[PDB]
Design a protein around this ligand. Sequence first.
Ligand SMILES: Nc1nc(-c2cccc3cccnc23)c2cn[nH]c2n1
Ligand SMILES: Nc1nc(-c2cccc3cccnc23)c2cn[nH]c2n1
Ligand SMILES: [Ca+2]
Ligand SMILES: [Ca+2]
Ligand SMILES: [Ca+2]
Ligand SMILES: [Ca+2]
Lengths: 117, 116, 117, 116
Amino acid sequence: KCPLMVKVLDAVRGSPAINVAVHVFRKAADDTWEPFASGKTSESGELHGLTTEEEFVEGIYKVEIDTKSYWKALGISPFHEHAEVVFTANDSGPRRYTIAALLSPYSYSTTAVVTNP
Amino acid sequence: CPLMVKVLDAVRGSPAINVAVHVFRKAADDTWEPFASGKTSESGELHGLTTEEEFVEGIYKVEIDTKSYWKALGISPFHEHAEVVFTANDSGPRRYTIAALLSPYSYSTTAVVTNP
Amino acid sequence: KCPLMVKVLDAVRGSPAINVAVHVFRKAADDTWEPFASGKTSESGELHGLTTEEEFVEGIYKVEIDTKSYWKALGISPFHEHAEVVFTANDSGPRRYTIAALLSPYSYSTTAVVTNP
Amino acid sequence: CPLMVKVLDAVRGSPAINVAVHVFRKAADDTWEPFASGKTSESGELHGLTTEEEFVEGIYKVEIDTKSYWKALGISPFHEHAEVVFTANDSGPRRYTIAALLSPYSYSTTAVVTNP
Ligand SMILES: Nc1nc(-c2cccc3cccnc23)c2cn[nH]c2n1
Ligand SMILES: Nc1nc(-c2cccc3cccnc23)c2cn[nH]c2n1
Ligand SMILES: [Ca+2]
Ligand SMILES: [Ca+2]
Ligand SMILES: [Ca+2]
Ligand SMILES: [Ca+2]
């Protein structure tokens, strides 16, 4: 899957970032964050299967990538608690979203690739 | 001078001017308490957010309102904002600069932590 | 293919960067750049098939991504002439290299993912 | 002040200090003629590369010796260097800053072009 994919790379080692926890939240009508989906990156640094076309409705989503546990498992003390990405999804109908992240101990960058299925 | 934010625009090749920035500190109940805020200057910098006495160790979030910035320029943005969350640890003397580089569908952020 | 792949994304549109020309050079024994391989990114922003295991020997390689023609075709006046990446390849035996690039009109970033086949 | 380079280190969270920077201009035969060079300061900045009279329109390459920088820190690097190639165009008054953010297997660069 499918409509929402996350890909994570490590800029120190030149590798996929493997076994990174990713948590997705959706803003509820009362303005709180409701848990939506979560998972871990594979050996290729990718996380497929978060959601389905049925479940992934319009809304404001937050994707939190647990960069802190990643670095700590490699024995490194990182700066950021996580890398987040917050965006409005599916406003003009369903789209496929890939959230890509590139990690360093004191920096991260993220991009979105949005395609019309 | 303990906390400074600096923002650049990767589309126009310029400082990101008049961008709203809010800083929050994580409270004991895990909620975010507003801590400081301002708007970037003509140089894309925001100085004077806090003081040495106020800025204690803890977990902080710097939220940069990128969506309003892109909309004021007529450019279509992806993200609601950019949120930068980090732990401040006392080691010896430190100044923190949070630097960010903005594009419509991407952003990057780095921390520059120096000893005055 | 295979040992050398290039992937290009557009940070303005949130899309793959399609039909981007990529030229690869290898440093010759006289210290000049010898043409090595070239191609164009596909609809997915990827360029496979540049080289083969046989041809891709040790050496210092330059990958030049024609970012200027990309932007000009979209009607935009960009800053950089190209995005390059220069690196020593295969020094401790064959590796697979992915050179990924993220483009904006006044900025680019690049990362390398190196895996042991 | 027409050309400045500023370099940051994404691993250590610091300015990239004592990094060698060479600038070349593209010659009529398509070769690169050395034009200016220096080493970044304690702030990671390199000022005084050129003068307004010298810096004419044309195609320039800023080569940042990232490999020597990482090796002096004991960190294993991927790239030989970082080469940043751009066209300078006269529009009205302009100052150029080439900013770069370094990691061992990645770098990014942006241009900040302002009107003094
Ligand atoms: N945020 C971010 N993600 C990427 C990036 C991450 C994962 C897969 C990709 C595939 C192609 C191009 N990019 C990536 C890259 C690469 N250079 N800079 C970047 N910045
Ligand atoms: N290429 C590049 N340069 C920067 C960057 C480098 C040097 C000084 C700056 C001052 C303000 C904002 N940015 C910078 C930053 C920061 N986050 N991501 C980046 N990417
Ligand atoms: Ca709608
Ligand atoms: Ca402390
Ligand atoms: Ca060898
Ligand atoms: Ca001109």
